[PDB]
Design a protein around this ligand. Structure first.
Ligand SMILES: [Mg+2]
Ligand SMILES: [Mg+2]
Ligand SMILES: [Mg+2]
Ligand SMILES: [Mg+2]
Ligand SMILES: [Mg+2]
Ligand SMILES: [Mg+2]
Ligand SMILES: [Mg+2]
Lengths: 182, 127, 96, 211, 56, 283, 21, 8
RNA sequence: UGAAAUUCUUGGAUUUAUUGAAGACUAACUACUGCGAAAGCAUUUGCCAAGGACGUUUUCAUUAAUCAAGAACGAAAGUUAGGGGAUCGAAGAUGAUCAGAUACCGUCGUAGUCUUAACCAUAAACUAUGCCGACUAGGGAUCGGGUGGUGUUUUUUUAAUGAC
RNA sequence: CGUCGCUAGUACCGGAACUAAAAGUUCCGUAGGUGAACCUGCGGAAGGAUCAUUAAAG
């Protein structure tokens, strides 16, 4: 184990939650992962370092940095904490304009279609595909297993292309069966 | 006592490239892909394929003399997605576990100021 | 203040009958469950019944209703519902 | 039938004397049959943090071109400068105006180059308005001031002197002091430096730079 | 309409006769179906190369 | 799949087929057999092509124990892949997916039917029936009018079919011309294809394309080779010769400034003859 | 069988742990 | 807060 | 690709690095905020004229509103004659035709997409809402101008301006 | 347990021999269409379901 460092710049809009969630973020990194944690208030970037005498797992530093990045993108703390717990969790990321060049009201309505009324539509994809989705304006981030995120991605893409929520909800249910069956 | 390399990771939808080169970049040290480590074309893009490619490059780099690498992750970019996929992330994770020191991480995905039309068309693509 | 302005501004542009219809029904349930609306005293009912008799605003002699009747627009189910809701609303006011 | 690395052979690179840490790693190339021809024209890009040993410069990179070879030592020269993409994406934010200027100008050494500078509007200490948009007239005045400045430093300096100005980011402070009255600004930076054309090769000027 | 149609029929018959005067085979001639391609693989290039060799 | 249920339209189809008592009928897409039982009633014998083995089994069950049982014959396979027997009349309500190819097969049968009654999608039927100068006049119209004559029998509605489709339908009559005109299929199709890329532009514009020029040059070189006259075969040897041949023929035929959509059979025939005169062979 | 349309009380850590066990 | 601004 | 297959590839594909050429388009800043009669309008700088609002104790004195006739402009697509032709791409060709959440996928790609000189005058050209004028509620946000303050910051000599 | 079959193969002069054979979303304008129960290109509309975070020159 060698002395190493990471630098993850947290955007301004995620600063206050980080101040909110700080009491629950350094314990797992400094105890279980045995890592040395800070941020530079001047640079507003959370700095994470491998402590050679105490850190033991070679992959802890990358695991911690990725855990931070999940929180930075907008994922809830408990959702991000799983990345520390597990080792096969990844983040899929893409924008609306990649699927279709939607502008003005068309872009806004496409976002509304993904989220659904009261967030129901996003939650169905969340539950059915066993993933988590953060919809940041036209920027979509999906966290989950590699097979799972691909399944969640297409349901989002179908909604972007114009598939009504109702039929997407039905397709999610057929997919939900095969997940429990396997 | 420390020799630095450059590990360029190109995470596509259908494949992942683990290409470690020299600091200048003209000289290739080792190139391993998801396809070379996997039997099915479907599973080339998977993190598992990326994981195997990393150790094979990692083992090769140690043999040559390289002990550390500067990571340069990137995606297909251009008119397509700008964010590296899970394949790139797993390769980055694997290099860290491989024991090779990593110097700096930066994304160099080709981002256009303004680009040509996307292949999808007006109705979209990626059903 | 900006945030409600962006949200309120965006909700304004959506004028779909279905979307507004669902929003009202959720709103009416919440008011009824929360009992936000004060109970009507008998006098208030009399005043309300006074207006309805004194005008007869909620019968098919109105301009909108008469137009639909005379041109076969009420054979369609949705418009007939929009007529029926109006008539029962009048009948509610007529109740003693 | 041959492992290339049997015929590959290592050189070590040395940076100009403008930078504190001259040791910037090592490169390889096939052994001469020559190696010098392949070695010349080689460009290596490295962060300022490594060369100056200070993390204040972690978001800045220099491209250095190999220009001479001597006894396994690759003497290089300044070729370009740039910022990290993550830095730029962190900089650009909503509810503020982006002011970008570019100037094509030649140094006293007949080194033709192009400088791109970026600046942002900022809200005052007591401001209650959400945003800090600046009127187009202010935008034009600030751009003119930046252009006049950058031209002034570049014309009256050498390329090595230009780098010695770039490292202490004095030019950014000069821009900040010049544009202070027009409109308050934040995050004033020399975003990028391109080297368009080069003068005729002069090995003595490079030996002097490398000591 | 009928009489113009009859004249058109006669003219068509004359042209078709003069067409039988000028007739050849079509196996070797490239079809116009290729107008959209605008670029060709090696496989056809070998096929064309073999074809022109057979012609001489 | 969609099934017709109006008996009157089926009766009209079978009646206007005008099946003589000594005729053999190729009845494509037999369906439940509503058409088939009537056609068996007034036909020498009927040959039927079925994609679905179950559905043909239902047909056999329907016709079993009937006087017309011996007449019917059923073929199981793909209509296009099958090699067919001689037939005098073709009556089909086949899925329109094979509509365009079907016609040409009927046209290219070794002994073509004298009369066929075919059901198509409305737009396709109109394009078949389109005349020169019409908006929907296209390559299909010119080709089929070379090899046949197409007329309109009925407009068949959406409601008649269940489940209702998303487009109207129609029934038309096709009559293949006997004797067949003695014009090569390939040359005619090639000329029309080159000219109908944009039917409302000048023919000269159609020939201005670089790929068209390349194809015509290669064909000219091949024609010279067949005539035993030597040829260089380099890429741009005859470009200046083919271009001037094309300009001269287009000017002399007076067809250079006439749009493809407004040109009839005889104009195209004149153009073909002139091109053969000057030595250019299209397909 | 009906799909939940509300936030899962279980964190994704917890649902994946259920998946293993 | 531990680690807000100093090594923890 | 759901898996394949046309496709390119030991003459080195894909990927890496130093360049060069061609034609489009102006990301992030970007906000139904700004301008324009509408259609529409987003890189820097210069030139040409044009315009709304504001200030005015300047000037003319009904010169005005609406508008058949008649005229200017009119997204995208499209036509005539040149130029250009990178990307995408109607048409056409071709690989595969196995499996229904991934069921229309792939490759080549003519016309077009760009520009010059004229035609065509159509859109859910939408606030599905003619134009002018008067009156009829509270509130605080934003854009442009103007007025007031013995308000903050800057002018790091003052100040005066600029920004709040 | 016998005979000839049928499928594959080997030889021989239709015939006559040998071996093997685990199966039973809704549209508008324009332009096109030759596997058209409909597709496709360009521009436009909602007459289409807004959840989370968000002063970090803090
Ligand atoms: Mg603006
Ligand atoms: Mg206006
Ligand atoms: Mg005025
Ligand atoms: Mg042209
Ligand atoms: Mg006009
Ligand atoms: Mg509009
Ligand atoms: Mg008014």
């Amino acid at each position: 184990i060698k002395f190493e460092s990471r630098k993850i710049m947290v955007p301004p809009h995620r600063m206050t939650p980080l101040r909110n969630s700080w009491t629950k973020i350094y314990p797992p990194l400094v105890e279980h992962l045995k890592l040395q944690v800070r941020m530079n208030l001047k640079t507003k970037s959370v700095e994470l370092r491998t402590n050679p005498k105490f850190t033991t797992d070679p992959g802890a530093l990358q695991k911690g940095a990725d855990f931070i990045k999940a929180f930075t993108l907008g994922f809830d703390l408990d959702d991000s904490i799983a990345l520390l717990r597990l080792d096969d969790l990844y983040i899929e990321t893409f924008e609306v304009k990649d699927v279709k060049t939607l502008t003005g009201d068309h872009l806004s309505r496409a976002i509304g279609r993904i989220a659904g009324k009261d967030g129901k539509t996003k939650f169905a994809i969340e539950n059915a595909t066993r993933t988590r989705i953060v919809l940041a304006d036209s920027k979509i981030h999906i966290l989950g297993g590699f097979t799972h995120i691909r399944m969640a991605r297409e349901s989002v893409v179908s909604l972007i292309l114009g598939s009504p929520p109702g039929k997407v909800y039905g397709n999610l249910r057929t997919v939900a069966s095969r997940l429990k069956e396997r | 006592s420390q020799v630095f390399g450059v590990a360029r990771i190109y995470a596509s939808f259908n494949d992942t490239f683990v290409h470690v080169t020299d600091l200048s970049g003209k000289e290739t040290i080792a190139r391993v892909t998801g396809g070379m480590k996997v039997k099915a074309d479907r599973d080339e893009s998977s993190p598992y394929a990326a994981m195997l490619a990393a150790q094979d490059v990692a083992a090769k780099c140690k043999e040559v003399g390289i002990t550390a690498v500067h990571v340069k992750i990137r995606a297909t970019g251009g008119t397509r997605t700008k964010t590296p996929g899970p394949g790139g992330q797993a390769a980055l994770r694997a290099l860290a576990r491989s024991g090779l020191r990593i110097g700096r991480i930066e994304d160099v995905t080709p981002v256009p100021s303004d680009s040509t039309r996307k292949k999808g068309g007006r109705r979209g693509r990626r059903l | 203040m900006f945030r409600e302005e962006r949200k309120a501004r965006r909700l304004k542009k959506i004028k779909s009958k279905t979307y507004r219809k669902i929003k009202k029904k959720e709103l009416m349930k919440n008011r009824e469950l929360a009992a936000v609306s004060s109970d009507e005293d008998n006098e208030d009912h009399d005043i309300a019944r006074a207006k309805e008799r004194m005008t007869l605003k909620h019968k098919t002699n109105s301009k909108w209703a008469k137009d639909m009747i005379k041109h076969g627009m009420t054979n369609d189910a949705e418009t007939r519902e929009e007529m029926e809701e109006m008539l029962r609303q009048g009948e509610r006011l007529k109740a003693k | 039938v041959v492992d290339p690395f049997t015929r590959k052979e290592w050189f070590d690179i040395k940076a100009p004397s403008t930078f504190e840490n001259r040791n910037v790693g090592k490169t390889l190339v096939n052994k001469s049959t020559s190696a010098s021809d392949a070695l010349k024209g080689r460009v290596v890009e490295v962060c300022l943090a490594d060369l100056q040993g200070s993390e204040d410069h972690s978001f800045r990179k220099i491209k250095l071109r190999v220009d001479e070879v001597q006894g396994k030592n690759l003497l290089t020269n300044f070729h370009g400068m740039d910022f990290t993409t993550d830095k730029l994406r962190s900089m650009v934010r909503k509810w503020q105006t982006l002011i970008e200027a570019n100037v094509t100008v030649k140094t006293s050494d007949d080194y033709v180059l192009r400088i791109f500078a970026i600046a942002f509007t900022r809200k005052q200490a007591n401001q209650v308005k959400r945003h800090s948009y600046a009127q187009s007239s202010h935008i034009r005045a600030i751009r003119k001031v930046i252009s006049e400045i950058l031209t002034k430093e570049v014309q009256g300096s050498t390329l090595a002197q230009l780098t010695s100005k770039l490292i202490p980011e004095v030019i950014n402070k000069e821009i900040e002091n010049a544009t202070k009255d027009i409109f308050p600004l934040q995050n004033i930076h020399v975003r990028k430096v391109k080297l368009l054309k080069q003068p005729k090769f002069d090995v003595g000027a490079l030996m002097a730079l490398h000591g | 309409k009928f009489i113009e149609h009859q004249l058109k029929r006669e003219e068509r018959k004359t042209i078709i006769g003069k067409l039988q005067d000028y007739k050849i085979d079509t196996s070797l001639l490239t079809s116009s179906k290729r107008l959209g391609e605008g670029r060709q693989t090696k496989k056809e290039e070998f096929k064309e190369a073999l074809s022109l060799e057979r012609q001489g | 799949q969609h099934i017709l249920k109006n008996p009157l339209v089926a009766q009209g189809i079978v009646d206007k087929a005008q099946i003589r008592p000594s005729d053999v009928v190729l009845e494509v897409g037999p369906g439940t057999g509503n058409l088939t039982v009537r056609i068996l009633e007034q036909a020498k014998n009927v040959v039927a092509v079925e994609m679905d083995p179950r559905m043909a089994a239902e047909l056999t069950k329907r016709v079993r124990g009937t006087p017309v049982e011996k007449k019917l014959e059923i073929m199981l396979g793909d209509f296009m892949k099958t090699e067919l027997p001689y037939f005098d009349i073709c009556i089909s309500n086949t899925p329109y997916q094979i509509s365009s190819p079907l016609v040409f097969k009927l046209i290219n049968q070794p002994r073509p039917p004298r009369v066929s009654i075919l059901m198509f999608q409305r737009e396709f039927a109109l394009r078949l029936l389109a005349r020169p100068g019409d908006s929907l006049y296209c390559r299909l119209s010119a080709n089929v009018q070379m090899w046949a004559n197409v007329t309109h029998i009925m407009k068949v509605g959406k409601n008649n079919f269940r489940p209702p489709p998303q487009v109207e339908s129609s029934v038309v009559r096709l009559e293949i011309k006997n004797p067949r005109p003695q014009v090569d299929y390939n040359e005619w199709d090639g000329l029309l294809r080159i000219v109908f890329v944009r039917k409302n532009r000048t023919i000269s514009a159609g020939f201005k394309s670089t790929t068209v020029m390349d194809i015509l040059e290669k064909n000219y070189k091949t024609f010279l080779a067949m005539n035993n006259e030597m040829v260089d075969d380099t890429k741009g040897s005859m470009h200046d010769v083919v271009k001037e041949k094309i300009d001269t023929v287009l000017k002399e035929t007076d067809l250079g400034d006439k749009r493809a959509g407004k040109c009839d059979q005889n104009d195209f025939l004149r153009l073909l003859y002139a091109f053969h005169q000057v030595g250019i062979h299209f397909s | 069988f009906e799909l939940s349309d509300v936030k899962s009380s279980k964190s994704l850590a917890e649902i994946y742990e259920d998946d293993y066990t | 807060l531990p680690g807000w601004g100093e090594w923890a």
